[PDB]
Write a protein that binds this DNA or RNA. Structure first.
Ligand SMILES: [Mg+2]
Ligand SMILES: [Mg+2]
Length: 132
RNA sequence: UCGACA
DNA sequence: ATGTCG
C-alpha cells in the first residue's frame, strides 16, 4: 500500500529554530531530485511546508501526476489551507524564510494541481525515503 | 493529555 | 531533553 510511484520530501535542521534545508527524492530509488540550499534560520514546520510546495511546483512543471509523501501532519494541513501558521518571529535573521513561505502561499493561490499529498506512515513503514 | 514532526 | 505545530 506504499505508492512507490511517488515523490517523498523531508526537512533537516540544525536547531529548531535553526538552519533549515529540505529535499525531494524518488520514493522508489532514493534518487535526489531537488535539494534546497540551507536557509540560516527557520522552523521544522516551515521547512516541511516549503518541501511539499517545492514538490508540487516540481511535479507540475514536469507534468507529473505522482503523489507527494510527507511525514508532517502540520505541513500537510498548511498546504491544504494554503496558509502556513508559523509562530516564528520576524526579524532580519528570519526574513529569508518568511519571504520563501509568503512566495510559496502565493504560488498555491495562483496555480492549480491535483497532486495527492499523502501522509507517510512512519510507524508502519519506517522512515521516509527523503529523511536526513 | 493525545497526534505528527524537528 | 527542548522547540514546532494541531
Ligand atoms: Mg519530516
Ligand atoms: Mg526526517
Amino acid at each position: 500500500e506504499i505508492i512507490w510511484e511517488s515523490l517523498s520530501v523531508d526537512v533537516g535542521s540544525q536547531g529548531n529554530p535553526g538552519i533549515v534545508e529540505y529535499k525531494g527524492v524518488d520514493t522508489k530509488t532514493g534518487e535526489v531530485l531537488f535539494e534546497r540550499e540551507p536557509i540560516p534560520i527557520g522552523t521544522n514546520n516551515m521547512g516541511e511546508f516549503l518541501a511539499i510546495v517545492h514538490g508540487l511546483r516540481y511535479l507540475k512543471e514536469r507534468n507529473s501526476r505522482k503523489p507527494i509523501y510527507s511525514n508532517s501532519q502540520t505541513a500537510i494541513k498548511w498546504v491544504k489551507d494554503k496558509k502556513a501558521k508559523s509562530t516564528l518571529v520576524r526579524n532580519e535573521e528570519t526574513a529569508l524564510i518568511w519571504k520563501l513561505v509568503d512566495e510559496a502561499e502565493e504560488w498555491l493561490n495562483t496555480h492549480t494541481y491535483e497532486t495527492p499529498i499523502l501522509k507517510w506512515q512512519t510507524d508502519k513503514w519506517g522512515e521516509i525515503k527523503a529523511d536526513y
